[PDB]
């Protein structure tokens, strides 16, 4: 489940994160924008 | 957990 409007990167350092262009954010949190 | 990489820099 990925929301169109952020890019995501699942890094093997044991943490995946989503970047929102709409709010300018880098976060572990699952995007609510998605619904 | 060591935190997030800076915002909007995405190597694809």
Swiss-Prot record, chain A:
Q: Its domain of life? A: Eukaryota
The tissues where this chain's protein is expressed are given as: Ubiquitously expressed, with highest levels in prostate, pancreas, and kidney. Expressed in melanocytes.
* PTM info: Phosphorylated by SGK1 or PKA; which impairs interaction with SCNN. Interaction with YWHAH inhibits dephosphorylation.
Q: Where is the WW domain?
A: 1-33
Q: Where in the cell is it found?
A: Cytoplasm; Golgi apparatus; Endosome, Multivesicular body
Q: Tell what triggers its expression.
A: By androgens in prostate, and by albumin in kidney.
* Free-text note on domains in this protein's UniProt record: WW domains are involved in recognizing PPxY motifs in substrate proteins.
Disease linkage: Periventricular nodular heterotopia 7: A form of periventricular nodular heterotopia, a disorder resulting from a defect in the pattern of neuronal migration in which ectopic collections of neurons lie along the lateral ventricles of the brain or just beneath, contiguously or in isolated patches. PVNH7 is an autosomal dominant disease characterized by delayed psychomotor development, intellectual disability, and seizures in some patients. Additional features include cleft palate and toe syndactyly.
Q: Quaternary state and partners of this protein?
A: Interacts with UBE2E3. Interacts with NDFIP1; this interaction activates the E3 ubiquitin-protein ligase. Interacts with NDFIP2; this interaction activates the E3 ubiquitin-protein ligase. Interacts (via WW domains) with SCN1A. Interacts (via WW domains) with SCN2A. Interacts (via WW domains) with SCN3A. Interacts (via WW domains) with SCN5A. Interacts (via WW domains) with SCN8A. Interacts (via WW domains) with SCN9A. Interacts (via WW domains) with SCN10A. Interacts (via WW domains) with CLCN5. Interacts with SMAD2. Interacts with SMAD3. Interacts with SMAD6. Interacts with SMAD7. (Microbial infection) Interacts with Epstein-Barr virus LMP2A.
According to its UniProt entry, what is the function of this protein? E3 ubiquitin-protein ligase that mediates the polyubiquitination of lysine and cysteine residues on target proteins and is thereby implicated in the regulation of various signaling pathways including autophagy, innate immunity or DNA repair. Inhibits TGF-beta signaling by triggering SMAD2 and TGFBR1 ubiquitination and proteasome-dependent degradation. Downregulates autophagy and cell growth by ubiquitinating and reducing cellular ULK1 or ASCT2 levels.
- Name it: E3 ubiquitin-protein ligase NEDD4-like
The source organism is: Homo sapiens
Swiss-Prot record, chain B:
Lineage, top-rank taxon, reads Eukaryota
Which residues get modified to Phosphothreonine? 2
Q: Post-translational modification, briefly?
A: Phosphorylated on serine and threonine residues. CDK-mediated phosphorylation occurs in a cell-cycle dependent manner and inhibits both the transcriptional activity and antiproliferative functions of SMAD3. This phosphorylation is inhibited by flavopiridol. Maximum phosphorylation at the G(1)/S junction. Also phosphorylated on serine residues in the C-terminal SXS motif by TGFBR1 and ACVR1. Acetylation in the nucleus by EP300 in the MH2 domain regulates positively its transcriptional activity and is enhanced by TGF-beta.
Question: Where in or outside the cell?
Answer: Cytoplasm; Nucleus
Oligomer status and interactors: Monomer; in the absence of TGF-beta. Homooligomer; in the presence of TGF-beta. Heterotrimer; forms a heterotrimer in the presence of TGF-beta consisting of two molecules of C-terminally phosphorylated SMAD2 or SMAD3 and one of SMAD4 to form the transcriptionally active SMAD2/SMAD3-SMAD4 complex. Part of a complex consisting of MAGI2/ARIP1, ACVR2A, ACVR1B and SMAD3. Forms a complex with SMAD2 and TRIM33 upon addition of TGF-beta. Found in a complex composed of SMAD3, RAN and XPO4; within the complex interacts directly with XPO4. (Microbial infection) Interacts with SARS-CoV nucleoprotein.
Disease field reads: Colorectal cancer: A complex disease characterized by malignant lesions arising from the inner wall of the large intestine (the colon) and the rectum. Genetic alterations are often associated with progression from premalignant lesion (adenoma) to invasive adenocarcinoma. Risk factors for cancer of the colon and rectum include colon polyps, long-standing ulcerative colitis, and genetic family history. Loeys-Dietz syndrome 3: An aortic aneurysm syndrome with widespread systemic involvement. The disorder is characterized by the triad of arterial tortuosity and aneurysms, hypertelorism, and bifid uvula or cleft palate. Patients with LDS3 also manifest early-onset osteoarthritis. They lack craniosynostosis and intellectual disability.
Give the comment on domains.
The MH1 domain is required for DNA binding. Also binds zinc ions which are necessary for the DNA binding.
Query: What family name appears in the similarity comment?
Result: Belongs to the dwarfin/SMAD family.
Summarize the protein's role.
Answer: Receptor-regulated SMAD (R-SMAD) that is an intracellular signal transducer and transcriptional modulator activated by TGF-beta (transforming growth factor) and activin type 1 receptor kinases. Binds the TRE element in the promoter region of many genes that are regulated by TGF-beta and, on formation of the SMAD3/SMAD4 complex, activates transcription. Also can form a SMAD3/SMAD4/JUN/FOS complex at the AP-1/SMAD site to regulate TGF-beta-mediated transcription.
Q: Which gene encodes it?
A: SMAD3
């Amino acid at each position: 489940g990925l929301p169109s409007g952020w890019e995501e990167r699942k890094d093997a350092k044991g943490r995946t994160y989503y970047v929102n262009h709409n709010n300018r954010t880098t976060t572990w949190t699952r995007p609510i924008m998605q619904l | 957990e060591t935190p997030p990489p800076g915002y909007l820099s995405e190597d694809g």
